């Protein structure tokens, strides 16, 4: 029903990371918020009425000389957290279920720098892409590594996975869709502006794009239909689709965060920030959305 589309977003919560934040994640149970910085991960708790907090519940640093963190990802079940960065010899998995925060197994990525994180929980697989233009798949169960998807140095800035298909996009203004079950070349779709973000609809098979010129497009998996609904006055580098499949939110260099409704691409009232917004995520509970901009993060409440 149309009632699923929200109406109002409000927030009274502020997190002071202390340095510019590059990724965010939120637990489905709506209990904790995770922010990734340039040198360490910090874990925070929502169970409080504090307006702004400067102290995390824990600080998880990396100690390799010349290390550099870039991204973090949380799986759906709110169990395992993945991390990766620059000048690191391995990727890490962190477990939340144990009474104290302890690290888990690691897999190597020496000689490469990664900016991509996606995980197929039920199949126990993880996905990452590297600046060289390669995508590799890791197994979270038996720690085996088998994958080689490369060929294009560009076009691998964003990753979205749906079953046995992986969608990629980058600065070449081109969109590609891969098949995990085949050793053949992918299928190309050509656009006229740089792609900066991707998000997939969980209910119907549609993929949402964000373009560098402020335009928004919908691509259908049937390979023929294409739509164009939305316009912003600057670059967009963040799109996120709600788990119910009815609405999405978009952020970009315009520093404006707004809510859109499928399929007319109509605007729901928006909330303005003060600086470019580069991080956005929505909980599997379909009640909270968290953002990352500058040295701060925020937690928003969704009203239906």
């Amino acid at each position: 029903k149309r009632l699923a589309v929200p109406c109002k977003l409000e927030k009274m919560r502020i997190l002071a990371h202390g340095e510019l934040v590059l990724a965010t994640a939120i637990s489905s149970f709506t209990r904790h918020v995770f922010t990734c910085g340039r040198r360490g991960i910090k874990v925070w708790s929502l169970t409080g009425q504090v307006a702004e907090d400067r102290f995390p519940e824990s600080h998880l640093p990396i100690q390799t000389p010349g290390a550099f963190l870039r991204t973090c990802l949380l799986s759906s079940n709110s169990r395992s957290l993945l991390t990766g960065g620059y000048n690191l010899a391995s990727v890490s998995v962190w477990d939340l279920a144990a009474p104290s925060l302890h690290v888990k197994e690691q897999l190597p990525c020496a000689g490469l720098n990664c900016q991509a994180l996606d995980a197929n929980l039920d199949a126990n697989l993880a996905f990452a892409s590297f600046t060289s233009g390669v995508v590799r798949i890791w197994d979270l169960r038996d720690q085996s590594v088998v994958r080689d998807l490369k060929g294009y140095p560009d076009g691998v800035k964003s990753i979205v996975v749906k079953g046995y298909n992986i969608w990629t996009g980058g600065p070449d203004a081109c969109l590609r869709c891969w098949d995990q079950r085949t050793i053949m070349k992918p299928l190309e779709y050509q656009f006229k502006s740089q792609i900066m973000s991707l998000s997939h609809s969980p209910q119907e098979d549609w993929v949402l794009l964000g373009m560098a010129n402020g335009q928004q497009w919908l691509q259908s998996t049937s390979g023929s239909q294409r739509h164009m609904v939305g316009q912003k006055d600057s670059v967009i580098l963040s799109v996120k689709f709600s788990p119910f499949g009815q609405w999405w939110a978009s952020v970009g260099m315009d520093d404006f965060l707004g809510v859109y409704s499928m399929p007319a691409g109509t605007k729901v009232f928006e909330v303005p920030e003060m600086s470019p917004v580069t991080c956005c995520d929505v909980s599997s509970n379909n009640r909270l959305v968290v953002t990352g901009s500058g040295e701060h993060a925020s937690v928003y409440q969704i009203t239906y």
Binding site: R31, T47, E57, S58, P99, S100
Partner: protein
């Protein structure tokens, strides 16, 4: 030892209910190893001990009262299933 994901505040005012010792060994096992997994999945803190001459076990549940009730009800339903199965087996 309080788990890191459990807030210290929720420790206050726990819920306490009693059960039978054999029921406790059927539910949680003789080694009580399954307690942490149920604690996580239920999001509450549990204590199991035998307090009445080896006959009656006391269980304490920490957390928000609704979670306490949910855990208590699940445990009571499992104990009732065990009671029914044991009565049916003994009558057989």
């Amino acid at each position: 030892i309080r788990p890191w994901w459990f807030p210290v505040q929720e420790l206050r005012d726990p819920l306490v209910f009693y059960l039978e010792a054999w029921l406790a060994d059927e539910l949680f096992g003789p080694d009580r190893a399954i307690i942490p997994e149920m604690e996580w999945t239920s999001q509450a803190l549990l204590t199991v001990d035998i307090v009445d001459s080896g006959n009656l076990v006391e269980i304490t549940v920490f957390g928000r009262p609704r979670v306490q009730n949910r855990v208590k009800s699940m445990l009571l339903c499992l104990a009732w299933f065990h009671r029914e199965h044991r009565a049916r087996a003994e009558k057989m």
